[PDB]
Design a protein around this ligand. Structure first.
Ligand SMILES: OC[C@H]1O[C@@](CO)(O[C@H]2O[C@H](CO)[C@@H](O)[C@H](O)[C@H]2O)[C@@H](O)[C@@H]1O
Ligand SMILES: *C/C=C(\C)CC/C=C(\C)CCC=C(C)C
Ligand SMILES: [Zn+2]
Lengths: 315, 410, 9
């Protein structure tokens, strides 16, 4: 009906349809702490919310009241819980509620309660038909919204909507190849569909990632993804990768490439590689270069790696 | 060396300019935003250098104290958005005061105790305010606040029997916990539950069955931990995950190697502070969520007998973090912030200070090594890496509650 | 200055 900012808005304490119930003031005690000096409108709505909650009034007026309580503080999870109790008790049209939560999330996309409420509605309706498009709109405004990506992964996994997600991932990587949330979604999609054990798939991914690295050498996300899809089997299991990186080193001696080389050497030494002494020496040299010049912010980490290597492979 | 009135800074070294972002001539929203922050930060850094004269940095303790003292009593309507997080405000403010070694008057302490009692739910746990349903976030905050006060009055406010029943009412079969009845699930809940359960001595053998395994599923390809299995590595969720596993004595469930490499990579080479996710902006609050992981990892590796561990430093640039917090995160009017250009708030005041404390103090076994940048008065009280309240408070609380039995269990 | 959007719950 009428919104909190509407010119005709009337305080609940002045509404005839609410005269039959007494408001319940919040009791902060005689000597309050972290006491918020609420506006008259805020206190009015919550004094009546406390009233309906205390009486557990499952009514249409109570339902409308929660809308105002939510506008005042969308992070009040108690109000949201009560609103859901009312949605069921009053048998409210859930599609209408979906339109409502859509608008609310657009306004407060980083709120935990609004996303959970939406998930509950989708679960109750078992209808994910609007999800991918809605989430895409939110991500169009903030491509890294954590809540949006989390909801997206849930919808895709729960309703098996994998078919077009890799295409979506490719689209967003074209827009911003530095978007780590998208690289994570890439792993999410592949690991849950084809998997990375298919050598044709792995080669495709390694080639793609290397191409992205060549285009933007200092983009950490691509480097992390490359390591991510190869680490479990062991970086030393891919001999050609070492050679390729060693060739780019002279022209692309970024801390990411140098660190990756150390990671390869670490794994090589862990798998009884040949020329152990030479590999250890090369690894220690790089750790020093990283600690003293190329990645000084991580001096302590690189010094640690150096000592670790010596504790494990000195012989 | 240098006279006592001049202290060279890492962020002011001539070679530090080489740490500026290299966008490879390929601009995207990410690089554009990162470049904007670096430009502002360089301006800030330069304002603390006068050629070879570099005055010692100063933590404006008094300004922060007055800001905190006022907030503990009253807040403007600007905090209506936190009306369901009042125990958080109690914790953020009390912990900040604790770190600053500012005494809490007995009267104020009792008032906080009485208020949190009003926030406690009859079903167990604490809500965001009087009469609100219980929720693990304000429950975690309320318990920490009561432990910071540390009086028997504060300890006894907690209804332990109902608290354990409440935790049971949130436990899922896959090992995870809901944040509240009918609420969302993510790794924050596992930490909130483990934190309050361990401090109050209410852990049962079945309470956390499967929880360590669920948390491990949250560690992803990046090495960090996401909110739920499959999600992007995030500093806040990673702290929750590792801290919870440390409480459960199940840190080995994770790949500590990839975790260590991931968190150390989150410290910004130029700014000195930490980002919450790869390729995102620096933020003072991650000074705790991210840097706090290093003491936890140190402890974990030390328990395994790692012969390469340092006996004097955490595995992150302690000085650079202090430089970022002291030069970029202090509001001249009191309070701390996310980054230059952002307004102060109690949350950032709490975590920027918590992170500063971690950066100043190293401890392992019988070894203690402090690195307090700036004037000596900058030294903060230490904070426990698992609970983020004073270590003395942790010991006092755990000792007190260990004298009580686990509710209805032998 | 602008307010930080960081929320814990
Ligand atoms: O950081 C990688 C490390 O995490 C574990 C969990 O402890 O697995 C995560 O990462 C794998 C990719 O490397 C994913 O397949 C898996 O789903 C995710 O949980 C460890 O197995 C791994 O060594
Ligand atoms: C900008 C800061 C944000 C979004 C907060 C991130 C931190 C967390 C999520 C961790 C929450 C931890 C607890 C509730 C104990
Ligand atoms: Zn922050």
């Amino acid at each position: 009906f009428v919104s909190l900012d509407s010119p005709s808005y009337v305080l609940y304490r002045d509404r005839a349809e609410w005269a039959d119930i007494d408001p319940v003031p919040q009791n902060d005690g005689p000597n309050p702490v972290v006491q918020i000096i609420y506006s008259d409108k805020f206190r009015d709505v919550y004094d009546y919310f406390r009233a309906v909650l205390q009486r557990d009034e499952r009514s249409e007026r109570a339902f409308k009241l929660t809308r105002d309580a939510i506008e005042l503080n969308a992070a009040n999870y108690t109000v949201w819980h009560f609103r859901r109790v009312l949605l069921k008790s009053l048998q409210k049209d859930l599609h209408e509620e979906m339109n409502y939560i859509t608008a609310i999330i657009e306004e407060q996309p980083k709120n935990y309660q609004v996303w959970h409420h939406r998930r509950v509605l989708v679960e109750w309706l078992r209808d994910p038909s609007q999800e991918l498009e809605f989430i895409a709109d939110i991500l169009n405004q903030d491509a890294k919204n954590y809540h949006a990506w989390q909801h997206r992964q849930w919808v895709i996994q729960e309703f098996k909507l994998w078919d077009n997600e890799l295409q979506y991932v490719d689209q967003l990587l074209k827009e911003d190849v530095r978007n780590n949330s998208v690289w994570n979604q890439r792993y999410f999609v592949i690991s849950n569909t084809t998997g990375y054990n298919d050598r044709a798939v792995l080669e495709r991914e390694v080639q793609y990632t290397l191409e992205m690295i060549k285009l933007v050498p200092h983009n950490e996300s691509a480097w992390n993804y490359l390591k991510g899809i190869l680490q479990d089997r062991g970086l030393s299991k891919y001999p050609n990768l070492l050679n390729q990186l060693l060739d780019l080193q002279p022209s692309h001696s970024s801390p990411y490439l140098i660190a990756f080389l150390v990671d390869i050497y670490e794994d090589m030494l862990e798998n009884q590689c040949d020329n152990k002494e030479d590999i250890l020496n090369k690894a220690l040299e790089l750790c020093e270069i990283l600690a003293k010049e190329k990645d000084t912010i991580r001096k302590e980490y690189w010094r640690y790696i150096g000592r670790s290597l010596q504790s494990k492979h000195s012989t | 060396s240098s006279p006592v009135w001049s202290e060279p800074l890492y962020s002011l070294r001539p070679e530090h300019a080489r740490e500026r972002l290299q966008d490879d001539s390929v601009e995207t929203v990410t690089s554009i935003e990162q470049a904007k922050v670096e430009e502002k930060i360089q301006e800030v850094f330069s304002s603390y250098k006068f050629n070879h004269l570099v005055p010692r940095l100063v933590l404006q303790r008094e300004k922060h104290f007055h800001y905190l003292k006022r907030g503990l009593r009253q807040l403007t309507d600007a905090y209506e958005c936190l009306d369901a997080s009042r125990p958080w405000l109690c914790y953020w403010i009390l912990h900040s005061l604790e770190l600053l070694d500012e005494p809490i008057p007995q009267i104020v302490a009792t008032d906080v105790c009485q208020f949190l009692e009003l926030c406690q739910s009859p079903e167990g746990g604490f809500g965001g305010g009087p009469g609100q349903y219980p929720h693990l976030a304000p429950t975690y905050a309320a318990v920490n606040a009561l432990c910071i006060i540390g009086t028997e009055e504060a300890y006894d406010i907690i209804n332990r029997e109902k608290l354990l029943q409440y935790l049971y009412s949130l436990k899922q079969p896959d090992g995870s916990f809901l944040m509240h009845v009918g609420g969302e699930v993510d790794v924050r809940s596992a930490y909130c539950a483990a934190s309050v359960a361990s401090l109050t001595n209410i852990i049962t053998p079945d309470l956390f069955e499967g929880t360590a395994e669920w948390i491990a599923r949250c560690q992803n390809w990046e090495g960090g931990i996401g909110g739920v299995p499959g999600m992007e590595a995030h500093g806040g969720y990673t702290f929750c995950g590792l801290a919870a596993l440390v409480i459960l004595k199940r840190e080995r469930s994770l790949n500590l190697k990839s975790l260590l490499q991931w968190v150390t990579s989150r410290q910004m080479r130029f700014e000195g502070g930490f980002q919450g996710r790869c390729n995102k902006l620096v933020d003072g609050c991650y000074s705790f969520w991210q840097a706090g992981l290093l003491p936890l990892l140190h402890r974990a590796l030390h328990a395994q007998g790692d012969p390469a561990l340092s006996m004097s430093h955490w595995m992150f640039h302690q000085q650079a973090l202090q430089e970022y917090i002291l030069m970029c995160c202090q509001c001249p009017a009191g309070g701390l912030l996310d980054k230059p250009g952002k307004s102060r708030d109690f949350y950032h005041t709490c975590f920027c200070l918590s992170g500063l404390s971690i950066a100043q103090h190293f401890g392992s076994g019988a070894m203690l090594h402090d690195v307090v940048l700036g004037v000596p008065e900058n030294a903060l009280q230490p904070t426990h890496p698992v609970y983020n309240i004073g270590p003395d408070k942790v010991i006092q609380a755990t000792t007190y509650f260990l004298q009580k039995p686990v509710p209805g269990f032998e | 200055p602008t307010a930080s959007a960081c929320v814990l719950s």
